[PDB]
């Protein structure tokens, strides 16, 4: 689709239209501090094209916003390559938010979820997070309306054993949380329950097909999900493959190469040879 940069959206909602054609945000997305906004600015607004965030997602003090079901309906993976504190999703002092509605979110690789101080917010205990996050031990969901034992939560849907009882799992009144059979793992499945291809991540339009993933599990290159970037391609942003040329062009006006990865910085013990961008170990001590 489109790959755009990590963005930081504040004050006027109008900045939000930068994302219109975007499919993957390479980096993080932060939408915050909007105090004059009203429900009606959101009841006609959507980003069905956003499928993936590489780093983290953070919503904070966005008023008038009541569900995310129309805003990011098709966001499916958050990869958490870089985290906010230790979180890959932060929902914080989101006054007005009632329900989450990320019914397409299937996996948060790496990070944890922190959803705090959201009076109004329910449909939280109706989510099985362990089907989405690797580590839920570090989840931090407190001080929401859900913690008043007094939530009008209603959903068909399936139940998991999180307590000492099974619990129906859904995002909104009209969307179930999708659960793939245990043995599909993270790879996703069709509505019937045929596992997607093993190099796919959350979902697929067709089964058994590495070009028909909705979000690559390992790395993306030339339409296909692959296990690893072959030379002459390099690991970038830890989700996609690129050639030397791409990596170089970005460096010049601070990207470098090491371990067959294209990265901002040489790691310790290494200095950057100028002829080839390749990090080399130091002759004696490293000035760096």
């Amino acid at each position: 689709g489109e790959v755009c940069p990590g963005m930081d959206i504040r004050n006027n909602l109008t900045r939000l239209h930068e994302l219109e054609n975007c499919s993957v945000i390479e980096g993080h997305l932060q939408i915050l501090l909007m105090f004059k906004t009203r429900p009606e600015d959101f009841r006609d607004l959507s980003f069905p094209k956003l499928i993936m965030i590489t780093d983290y997602l953070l919503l904070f003090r966005v008023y008038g916003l009541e569900s995310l079901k129309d805003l990011f309906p098709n966001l499916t993976v958050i990869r958490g390559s870089r985290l906010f504190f230790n979180y890959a999703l932060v929902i914080f002092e989101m006054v007005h938010l009632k329900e989450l509605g990320l019914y397409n979110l299937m996996n948060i690789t790496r990070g944890s979820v922190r959803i705090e101080k959201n009076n109004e917010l329910c449909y939280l205990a109706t989510i099985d997070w362990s089907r989405i996050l690797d580590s839920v031990e570090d989840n931090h969901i407190v001080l929401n309306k859900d913690d008043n034992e007094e939530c009008g939560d209603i959903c068909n849907c399936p139940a998991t054993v999180i307590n000492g009882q099974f619990v129906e799992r859904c995002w909104t009144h009209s969307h179930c949380q999708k659960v793939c059979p245990t043995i599909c793992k993270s790879h996703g499945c069709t509505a019937e329950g045929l596992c997607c291809h093993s190099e796919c991540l959350g979902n697929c339009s067709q089964p058994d097909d590495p070009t028909k993933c909705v979000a690559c599990r390992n790395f993306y290159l030339d339409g296909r999900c692959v296990e690893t970037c072959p030379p002459p391609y390099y690991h970038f942003q830890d989700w996609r493959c690129v050639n030397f040329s791409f990596c170089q062009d970005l460096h010049h006006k601070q990207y470098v190469i090491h371990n067959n990865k294209c990265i901002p910085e040489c790691p310790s013990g290494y200095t950057m040879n100028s002829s080839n961008l390749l990090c080399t170990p130091c002759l004696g001590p490293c000035p760096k």
């Binding site: 501090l33 105090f35 003090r61 002092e93 101080k117």
Partner: peptide
Amino acid sequence: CGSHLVEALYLVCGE
């Protein structure tokens, strides 16, 4: 002063 610092910063702005 946590939450209030947020409140206070806004009154200041109108921006």
